[PDB]
Amino acid sequence: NKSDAAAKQIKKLEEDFDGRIGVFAIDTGSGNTFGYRSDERFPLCSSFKGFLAAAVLERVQQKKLDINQKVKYESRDLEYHSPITTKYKGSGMTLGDMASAALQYSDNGATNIIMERFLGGPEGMTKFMRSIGDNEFRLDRWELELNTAIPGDKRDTSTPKAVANSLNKLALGNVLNAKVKAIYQNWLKGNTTGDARIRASVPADWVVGDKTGSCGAYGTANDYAVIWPKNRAPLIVSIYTTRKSKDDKHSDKTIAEASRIAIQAID
Ligand SMILES: *[B@@]1([O])OC2=C([C][C]1[N]C(=O)[C][C])[C]=[C][C]=C2C([O])=O
């Protein structure tokens, strides 16, 4: 009933912006789910940075890494959109700070440094996801080549459902112990790039942790979030979009409205 209405609403949204909208949402209190194109492939863009952060914390918890160890990169040619790492280039940053910058500011320098030094590159990132039982995710390339988002290209893609299920496992499940999971949640809650996406779709007094992606091409953008409503079990929302042409720009408002629709479908 409410599921079918919601589907018609997304379908009309995606025709209105001349693109493709992928949705998966989970109410963890009731078990209700809503899906639209949830098994189709969408570019990850920066959204996998949220998982990269979790992988770091997994290593830290195993004591293979110290959250406080210094990461130096004084000679590096910092990638475009390294807002945080560019400021600390001279002094270095703790591992914890680098990982949270990758997440909360989508810092590309942080991303590539962490993947080259600690995660074993895209293949290692992919292995981490396989290890939690995510079979859809694949990371093939580095920043910034991974943001191309060419129609038909399966590199650097996942599906809305797998993204949602993965976030649930990492943010709410048992891959990270109690202490390290709490850090992960606070990193997600401090994301800075998501104000006009899922955050814009819920009451202001709900607590949200999210991670956005913006490929900068093919109108390709996304957002996934854990949402703690007041006095009630958490929700998980995964929103992915692509557009037909290279020069097409992404639509924050579309993402926010798809969010609104998904949330309605599962409440
Ligand atoms: B990304 O996907 O996320 C992000 C960036 C960097 C990444 N995209 C690019 O580097 C393309 C130029 C920059 C601003 C915002 C975002 C975001 O929404 O995550």
CATH value at residue 221: 3.40.710.10
Three-state SS for 239?
A: strand
Per DSSP, which regions of 102-245 are E strands?
Answer: 157-158, 207-214, 221-228, 235-243
Q: How far apart are CA 230 and CA 241, in angstroms?
A: 29
**Which residues have a catalytic role annotated?**
46, 145
Contact in structure between 180 and 193 (CB atoms under 8 Å): no
Nearest residue to 140 via CA among 150, 209, 132: 150
Three-state SS for 107?
A: coil
Q: Does residue 157 have its Cβ closer than 6 Å to ligand 1?
A: no
Give the distance (Å) from ligand 1 centre to CA of residue 106: 6
Q: Does residue 196 have its Cβ closer than 6 Å to ligand 1?
A: no
Report CA 194 to chain centroid distance, whole Å. Answer: 10
Per DSSP, which regions of the chain are E strands?
Answer: 19-27, 33-36, 42-43, 70-71, 93-94, 157-158, 207-214, 221-228, 235-243
Which residues, other chains included, contact 204 with Cβ-Cβ below 8 Å and sequence gap of 6+?
none
For residue 155, give both structure tokens: 């590199």
In testing the pocket of ligand 1, which one of 81, 141, 223 has its CB within 8 Å of the most ligand atoms?
81
Which residues, other chains included, contact 229 with Cβ-Cβ below 8 Å and sequence gap of 6+?
202, 203, 206, 235
Which residues, other chains included, contact 28 with Cβ-Cβ below 8 Å and sequence gap of 6+?
168, 172, 233, 234, 235, 236
Query: For ligand 1, atom 15, which residue shows the shortest CA distance?
Result: 214
Query: For ligand 1, atom 1, which residue shows the shortest CA distance?
Result: 46
Give the distance (Å) from ligand 1 centre to CA of residue 96: 20
Q: How far apart are CA 228 and CA 50, in angstroms?
A: 18
Contact in structure between 139 and 44 (CB atoms under 8 Å): yes
Q: What domain range is 100 assigned to?
A: 1-267
Q: How far apart are CA 220 and CA 240, in angstroms?
A: 8
Q: Does residue 209 have its Cβ closer than 6 Å to ligand 1?
A: no
Give the distance (Å) from ligand 1 centre to CA of residue 66: 27
Q: Does residue 147 have its Cβ closer than 6 Å to ligand 1?
A: yes
Q: How many domains does the chain contain in total? A: 1
Resolution in A: 2.2
Contact in structure between 56 and 118 (CB atoms under 8 Å): yes
In which element (H, E) is residue 211 found? Answer: strand 207-214
Classify residue 213 as left (phi > 0), alpha (psi -120 to 50) or beta. beta
11: amino acid identity, one letter: K
Q: Does residue 159 have its Cβ closer than 6 Å to ligand 1?
A: no
Binding-site members for a beta-lactam are 46, 49, 106, 108, 212
